[PDB]
Amino acid sequence: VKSTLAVDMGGRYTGIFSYTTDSGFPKAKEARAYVLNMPDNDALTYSMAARTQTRHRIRSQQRFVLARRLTYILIEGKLKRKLSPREKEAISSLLRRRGYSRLESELDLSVLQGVESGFFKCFLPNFDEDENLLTQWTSLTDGYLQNNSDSRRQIQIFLESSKDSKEFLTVVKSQHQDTKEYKNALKVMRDDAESMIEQSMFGHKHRRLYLEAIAQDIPRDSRLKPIIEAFSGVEKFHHFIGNLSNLQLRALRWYFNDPSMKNNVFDKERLKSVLVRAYQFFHYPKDLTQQRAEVLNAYEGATDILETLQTLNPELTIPPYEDQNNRRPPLDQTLWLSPRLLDQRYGDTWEIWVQNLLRSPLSKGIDENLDTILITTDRKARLLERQSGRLIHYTSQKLYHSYVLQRLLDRTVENDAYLLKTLVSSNRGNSNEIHQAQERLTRDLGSQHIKKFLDFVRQYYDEVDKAKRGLWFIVEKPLMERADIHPPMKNDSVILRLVGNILCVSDLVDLSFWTRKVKGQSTVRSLCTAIEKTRKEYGNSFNYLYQRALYLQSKGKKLSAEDKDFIKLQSNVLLVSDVIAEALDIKEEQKKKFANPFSLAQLYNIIETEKSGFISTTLAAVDENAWRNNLQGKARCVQLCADTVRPFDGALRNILDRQAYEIAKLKAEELLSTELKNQTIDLVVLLESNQFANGTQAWFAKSFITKLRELTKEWCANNQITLAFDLYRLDAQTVSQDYRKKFALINKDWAKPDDKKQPIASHAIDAFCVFAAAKDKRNIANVLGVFDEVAEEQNLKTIAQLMPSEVNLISPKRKSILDKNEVGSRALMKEGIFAEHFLPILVRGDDCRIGFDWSESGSVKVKDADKLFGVLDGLLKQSQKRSVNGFETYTVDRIKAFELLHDVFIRPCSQKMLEQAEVLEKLHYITQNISVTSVYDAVNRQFKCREEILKDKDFDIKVDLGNRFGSAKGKITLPAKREWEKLVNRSELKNLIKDKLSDKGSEKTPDGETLIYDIFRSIPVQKLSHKATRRVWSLPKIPSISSGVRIKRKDSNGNDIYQLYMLNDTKCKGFVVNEKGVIDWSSDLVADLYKQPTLTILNGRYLKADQYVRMDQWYEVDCGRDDVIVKMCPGTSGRRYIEITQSKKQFEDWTGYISGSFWNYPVTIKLSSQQIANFVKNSQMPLLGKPRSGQITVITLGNTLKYWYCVESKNSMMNEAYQKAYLVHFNQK
RNA sequence: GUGGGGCCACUAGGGACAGGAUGUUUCAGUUAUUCGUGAAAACGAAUGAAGUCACUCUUAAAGUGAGCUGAAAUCACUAAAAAUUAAGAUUGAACCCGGCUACUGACUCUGUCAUCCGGGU
DNA sequence: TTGG
DNA sequence: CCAATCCTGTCCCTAGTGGCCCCAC
Ligand SMILES: [Mg+2]
Ligand SMILES: [Mg+2]
Ligand SMILES: [Mg+2]
Ligand SMILES: [Mg+2]
């Protein structure tokens, strides 16, 4: 029984062709074809960039919160009194906007005095040659600081123009000026301009600049006058604040990491221990030591820690760069002959065979360096045994025996007198060499257990051959063991043996050829540095140019410009090789191994640039491979095998992950359908022909195979299947060179459309061709059918009838928030908070209005207002009465209104409460600030019109109070519109913004955004040195809300803060169903994760649901025809989900959609408005409606299509038919 | 010409740690006074910062909106810390606690600390 | 880009 | 019709391009 599954593989679209042979060789119609969508990152997130950005945003917020908490704790501990809100506000103002921790180098502007300013007139036209460049640059920078508009525009022009320096370099070269000096000066002035822009317009500032700013601002702030009094001076308070603000998030995460600290208790010992924990976490730079020492001696030796924070300079405690070099070391992939598994398999006898083999004279010198190699742990199991302090499987003797065994089995053809891999192969011959090797064997090991040793040898060679193919995981019973322990990163002891190769040195204890100066101070290192510099400059063309130059020189041809340089490099490398041979005493052949520029360059890189990460394998593996290579002479034994590399390209890994299961599942569903009743074997075959533009294929195969075993272990163990696997990878172009073309010609149905991008079914066709191919290899896919190999026409005409009029599509999706138990792994609420207002009530007497002012546009008249006031009752708040002679204003109490809106949402409420909740939500409206730069179209590079900016959709509020709430019916204009008008009617803008769309022509203003900035860039006095910069100015509008949720949180003072967000995902989990089986389509059944005491869904009310129908529950509804079959599910609260299975001719007749048969169809079809209208008018069924935006998601293709879509809008007929189907199922139970 | 394996250079791709700035909303204050002198040209300064504009009333006393300034919040369950905006079938990652018996790293020259190892969430 |  | 936006230091990793030198099929 065969279970071949051919996979085309791809970035997104994955073609699969799978079958189960069952009845015999090849298969009947049982064959199946699938295509895998693997959607984009927005439909199924794989990249963690957004996730880690959110995590670091939360990390920064929590860092600030914990720093403020600790600062308040310490300040209250010193004061012996609680901080007033003003003191808290001042302290937090000090703690806000600390600079970045990067290292800043002072700019050397003096070099600007060494150049002529005229050559800079291309970037600085206003400059002249009559004055020094430094003076003009200082004046320009000072004007920029003083907000001089001319200086601002000059800086902007210089920054924009000096992006490319080629013209400036040509100009300076025209006067024979040094290009390097002028380039350095230009770089210096560019750096100065960029720093000025970053500090002034972004307002970043360094940490030291932040410390200086708070030092200047602490005396001026009077709210800190008591605090400074308790801290015995401004300097000590500044030191304390700067020291606290220098703490990282992890330092503040410690200390507070205690359940007893929810009451914010202050203890000096914990603070000192935490501060010692920090500044020991950092790896300070070597040049930055003696500053680490100062901080550590201050903190560790602190007898008061609070007085130490007050006395230590905050500039010393600025953290260094975070070097997470040991965050996750790679795992060594070396495969080691494991004495643990050797014990588990053969008892003691394997060491007995090793001992017997060692005694033979032919095994002399095979344990040459094992006394010095065994001291280094090589595998995870040996590491665990040594950690436990009890070596049982991995003693020194056992490790020696395993190493000797592995060396003997892996000996090269020259050194193998026993001729393994031939004396053991099942296809062995009967020559005299085999007989004499057998006689040489079993003379030491013994004929009593020769069979066991040969079985061991066969299994070992088979599994190392599988490892060499990158599929060592398939063996299901490993006798080798992966290292899975971290290697070191290239330290000096590692360095000595890394230079052992290349130079071919056996026991290099010290690099004497580099230190003892055989040829003076210029010994090797300078010449090798020059070689490396030249090779890096020439790049990847270095080898080609060097070879051409050497060939020309050997032929005696004329030398080119670079030929002399290459010959000089050849002489230099010859000299370096001579010096190395003199210092090491190596033979001619041993010397030639590194007589090329690449070897010397890599030696220099090793010695001088060693800090470049971890090495691949452990030192034991490196030493064993060095012994096996034996570069001093000929090689003995082959190098150690290794597994495929576990680390991958992150999200790409995830891709394959999902793909694997999304194929394995299908295979499971294919295998579960057939019993096969045979307890012997099933041969699952993998064929992969990924069209790369094994690496990723090996990991994909690993995941697919492991997940298939995990899926089918139950079905296998129930009735003894015990699946077997084999991997086959085909050539990149062979399947697409002739097989695909021949099949396209034979069938004439798909014809290999290409069309610059393969359609959805083309990948399935390619996977089918992969299955059909590989039969000619006779080694890969050897037994894929009978090896008859009939003529080309007959051979290829018996395979062209596949794809039995169906091509299934699998579209992975990100599960659902309803089916997810850890709902925190999903974005619940969208970013951005919306403002929640309530319309004021204006009362003159018997005349009442709802709105902002008594104008006919600013308010709506209310009749019978006593009903409104009676229903509102305690939810209204008087405006402190004030001058009642004018009028009375009643404003909705925000706290009571929000509490009541949560009460009516989270639990059943009385009729009065629901009534006043309805009134509150009728008075409710939502606004949000949008930037004034929205008046400018950043895509068309022109300003919008007044009708496109002041549209009534963004400023009108509908008042629709019913008869029992007065009769307040009308529309109000948001007063913020009058603030938008003032912006549009501004003098700087009244001409740029046109009046209407027709008036607005093709005129463009590329610098409109900077113009708007300069309009709104206000110039405050420098009263505070720690002020925040502003670069966004906005005005309110009425936004397009979507699933509003009001969240209750706590401020620093413990009050209730209500903030309105938009839900990012599904809100309704289903539709409630009564005892009679009737679905209530008009009720919102909010998912249970939103029913929290701190969450209030907008317009949501309590709804009891003992029985309901889920949004996923599909049913085949009572369609009016037998030609098509349609299924419905609720899907979403407002839009049903419709799945239609129908003849493809019916789909092409209903819709004006034309394509090159179903083979050319896409997975997602975008219907035009004409196609949507055709589909609606030709389906003759409002039961199915129309797709949302003409989007159709195809499930299966062929003569009978099967697709699904989300409707544009729900219908009564949709609900009626789904209710009929659900009632049928409910009554039938 | 074949792949496998150890070491170097090049771009990119991925994950993590530190974060920076600005937004959005909530709350509060501003709707403004005083000195340089008293002609006050007119701007500078002090009050921690902000002190402005528009609309609706009636005999200035305001209501409403915006702006400005300041802090606070900025997924929920969920709170001291952690996890929490990826997947979920399975996982990865993150963080905390313990240890130097030991794989790796920073110090150090012989003992600490970890991003390491073992647990837990 | 899909649930309001 | 709606979904906040940019930039910065470090470290380690995977995958192409060429080149070094061992072992082969
Ligand atoms: Mg604000
Ligand atoms: Mg804050
Ligand atoms: Mg170490
Ligand atoms: Mg620890």
CSV table of N, CA, C and O in Angstrom, one decimal, chain A residues 102-139:
chain,number,residue,atom,x,y,z
A,102,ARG,N,21.7,56.3,23.7
A,102,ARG,CA,22.7,56.1,22.8
A,102,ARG,C,23.9,57.0,23.1
A,102,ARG,O,23.8,58.0,23.7
A,103,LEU,N,25.1,56.6,22.6
A,103,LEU,CA,26.3,57.3,22.7
A,103,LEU,C,26.4,58.4,21.7
A,103,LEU,O,26.3,58.2,20.5
A,104,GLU,N,26.7,59.6,22.2
A,104,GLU,CA,26.8,60.8,21.3
A,104,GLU,C,28.2,61.3,21.3
A,104,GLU,O,28.8,61.5,22.4
A,105,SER,N,28.7,61.6,20.1
A,105,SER,CA,30.0,62.1,19.9
A,105,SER,C,30.0,63.6,19.6
A,105,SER,O,29.1,64.0,18.8
A,106,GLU,N,30.8,64.4,20.3
A,106,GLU,CA,30.8,65.9,20.0
A,106,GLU,C,31.3,66.2,18.6
A,106,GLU,O,32.2,65.6,18.1
A,107,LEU,N,30.6,67.1,18.0
A,107,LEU,CA,30.9,67.5,16.6
A,107,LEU,C,32.1,68.4,16.5
A,107,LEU,O,32.2,69.4,17.3
A,108,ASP,N,33.0,68.1,15.6
A,108,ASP,CA,34.2,69.0,15.4
A,108,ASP,C,33.9,69.9,14.2
A,108,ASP,O,34.3,69.7,13.1
A,109,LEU,N,33.3,71.0,14.5
A,109,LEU,CA,32.9,72.0,13.5
A,109,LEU,C,34.1,72.9,13.1
A,109,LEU,O,34.0,73.5,12.0
A,110,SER,N,35.2,72.8,13.8
A,110,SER,CA,36.4,73.7,13.5
A,110,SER,C,36.9,73.3,12.1
A,110,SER,O,37.5,74.2,11.4
A,111,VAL,N,36.8,72.1,11.6
A,111,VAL,CA,37.2,71.7,10.3
A,111,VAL,C,36.5,72.5,9.2
A,111,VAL,O,37.1,72.7,8.1
A,112,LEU,N,35.4,73.1,9.5
A,112,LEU,CA,34.7,73.9,8.5
A,112,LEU,C,35.5,75.2,8.1
A,112,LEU,O,35.3,75.8,7.1
A,113,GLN,N,36.5,75.6,9.0
A,113,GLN,CA,37.3,76.7,8.7
A,113,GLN,C,38.4,76.3,7.6
A,113,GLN,O,39.0,77.3,7.1
A,114,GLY,N,38.5,75.1,7.3
A,114,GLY,CA,39.5,74.6,6.3
A,114,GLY,C,39.0,74.5,4.9
A,114,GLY,O,39.8,73.9,4.1
A,115,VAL,N,37.9,75.0,4.5
A,115,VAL,CA,37.3,74.8,3.2
A,115,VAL,C,36.8,76.1,2.7
A,115,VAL,O,36.5,77.1,3.5
A,116,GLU,N,36.6,76.2,1.4
A,116,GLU,CA,36.0,77.4,0.8
A,116,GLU,C,34.5,77.3,0.7
A,116,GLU,O,34.0,76.2,0.2
A,117,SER,N,33.8,78.3,1.1
A,117,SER,CA,32.3,78.3,1.1
A,117,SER,C,31.7,78.3,-0.3
A,117,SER,O,30.5,77.9,-0.4
A,118,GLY,N,32.5,78.8,-1.3
A,118,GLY,CA,31.9,78.9,-2.6
A,118,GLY,C,31.4,77.6,-3.2
A,118,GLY,O,30.4,77.5,-3.8
A,119,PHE,N,32.2,76.5,-3.0
A,119,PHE,CA,31.8,75.2,-3.5
A,119,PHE,C,30.6,74.7,-2.8
A,119,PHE,O,29.9,73.8,-3.3
A,120,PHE,N,30.2,75.3,-1.7
A,120,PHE,CA,28.9,75.0,-1.0
A,120,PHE,C,27.7,75.8,-1.4
A,120,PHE,O,26.6,75.6,-0.9
A,121,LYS,N,27.9,76.7,-2.4
A,121,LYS,CA,26.8,77.5,-2.9
A,121,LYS,C,25.8,76.6,-3.6
A,121,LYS,O,24.6,77.1,-3.8
A,122,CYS,N,26.1,75.4,-4.1
A,122,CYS,CA,25.2,74.5,-4.7
A,122,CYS,C,24.1,74.1,-3.6
A,122,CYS,O,23.0,73.9,-4.0
A,123,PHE,N,24.5,73.9,-2.4
A,123,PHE,CA,23.6,73.5,-1.3
A,123,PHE,C,23.2,74.7,-0.4
A,123,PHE,O,22.2,74.6,0.2
A,124,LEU,N,24.1,75.7,-0.4
A,124,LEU,CA,23.8,76.9,0.4
A,124,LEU,C,24.0,78.1,-0.5
A,124,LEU,O,25.0,78.8,-0.4
A,125,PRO,N,23.0,78.4,-1.3
A,125,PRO,CA,23.1,79.6,-2.2
A,125,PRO,C,23.3,80.9,-1.5
A,125,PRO,O,23.9,81.8,-2.1
A,126,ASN,N,22.7,81.1,-0.4
A,126,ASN,CA,22.8,82.4,0.3
A,126,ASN,C,24.1,82.6,0.9
A,126,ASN,O,24.4,83.8,1.3
A,127,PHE,N,25.0,81.6,0.9
A,127,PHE,CA,26.4,81.8,1.5
A,127,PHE,C,27.2,82.5,0.4
A,127,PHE,O,26.9,82.6,-0.8
A,128,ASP,N,28.4,83.0,0.9
A,128,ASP,CA,29.3,83.7,0.1
A,128,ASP,C,30.7,83.3,0.5
A,128,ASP,O,31.0,82.6,1.5
A,129,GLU,N,31.7,83.8,-0.3
A,129,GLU,CA,33.1,83.5,-0.1
A,129,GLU,C,33.8,84.5,0.7
A,129,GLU,O,35.0,84.4,1.1
A,130,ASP,N,33.1,85.6,1.1
A,130,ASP,CA,33.8,86.7,1.8
A,130,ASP,C,33.9,86.5,3.3
A,130,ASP,O,34.6,87.2,4.0
A,131,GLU,N,33.3,85.4,3.8
A,131,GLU,CA,33.4,85.1,5.3
A,131,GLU,C,33.7,83.6,5.5
A,131,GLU,O,33.5,82.8,4.6
A,132,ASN,N,34.2,83.3,6.7
A,132,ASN,CA,34.5,81.9,7.0
A,132,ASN,C,33.2,81.1,7.1
A,132,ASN,O,32.2,81.6,7.5
A,133,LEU,N,33.3,79.9,6.6
A,133,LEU,CA,32.1,79.0,6.6
A,133,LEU,C,31.6,78.7,8.0
A,133,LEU,O,30.4,78.6,8.2
A,134,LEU,N,32.5,78.7,9.0
A,134,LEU,CA,32.1,78.4,10.4
A,134,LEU,C,31.2,79.5,10.9
A,134,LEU,O,30.2,79.3,11.6
A,135,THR,N,31.5,80.8,10.6
A,135,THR,CA,30.7,81.9,11.1
A,135,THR,C,29.3,81.9,10.5
A,135,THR,O,28.3,82.0,11.2
A,136,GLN,N,29.2,81.7,9.2
A,136,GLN,CA,27.9,81.6,8.5
A,136,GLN,C,27.1,80.4,9.0
A,136,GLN,O,25.9,80.6,9.2
A,137,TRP,N,27.7,79.3,9.2
A,137,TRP,CA,27.0,78.1,9.7
A,137,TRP,C,26.5,78.3,11.1
A,137,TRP,O,25.4,77.9,11.4
A,138,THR,N,27.3,78.9,12.0
A,138,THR,CA,26.9,79.2,13.3
A,138,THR,C,25.7,80.2,13.3
A,138,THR,O,24.8,80.1,14.1
A,139,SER,N,25.8,81.3,12.5
A,139,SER,CA,24.7,82.2,12.4
A,139,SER,C,23.4,81.5,11.9
A,139,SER,O,22.3,81.8,12.4
